[PDB]
């Protein structure tokens, strides 16, 4: 599938929980290729799971490092990972191979509840 | 833009998850590059819902429903009947100017994480 190739910028970090367990979430501002832009939230491990997804195939990806949960999550670790994901993203948003995957279209497209 | 796309509810099956739920496969693509979503009646049911009550002229269209017991099977004519009037659903949808603006009507047809 091509819907073009999209625009995406982590803004918006957060520290919370769920099953009692603390988790990072971001909010990612999508555009279409130059209201054409929507806002979807994703996990840490959402995030790692794409990676994991692409490196398989694109070992190039291993040397993109992403932030991991194996340290409390602080304020200090949300603008560091804030930036290592865009600078994931921007790696696959600019890279032919897989730009236009339904992998990615699934992670930054919305989400039904 | 939506608006060109088609969506085809393709195939329906009885599935389990945790009750009997009827499921679909739609075919989505560009009418002016496809792919697959799965979805239940319920999320069917549940976008009607959300375009409703905020168009509520869409309360006309009417979708399959059930009322029954969650052990109780669901039997093949009401699913193979049911793909029509879904499939009606979303080509009206998919033709309002204002729906398919809406993030809901994305989320829905895109694909899923
Ligand atoms: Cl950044
Ligand atoms: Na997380
Ligand atoms: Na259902």
Not at 12 to 18: G, H, I, K, L
Not at 24 to 46: D, G, M, P, Q
Not at 77 to 86: E, G, I, T, V
Request: proline share 3%; glycine share 2%; charged share 25%.
């Amino acid at each position: 599938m091509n819907l073009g190739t999209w625009r995406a910028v982590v803004s918006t970090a957060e520290a919370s929980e769920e099953n009692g367990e603390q988790m990072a979430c971001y909010f990612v501002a999508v555009s279409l290729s130059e209201n054409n832009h929507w806002t979807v939230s994703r996990k840490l491990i959402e995030f790692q799971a794409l990676h994991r997804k692409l490196t398989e195939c694109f070992p190039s990806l291993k040397k993109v490092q992403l932030p991991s949960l194996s340290k409390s999550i602080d304020q200090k670790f949300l603008d560091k990972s804030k930036n290592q994901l865009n600078a994931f993203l921007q790696k696959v948003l600019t890279d032919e191979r897989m730009c236009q995957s339904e992998a990615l279209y699934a992670f930054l497209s919305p989400s039904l509840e």
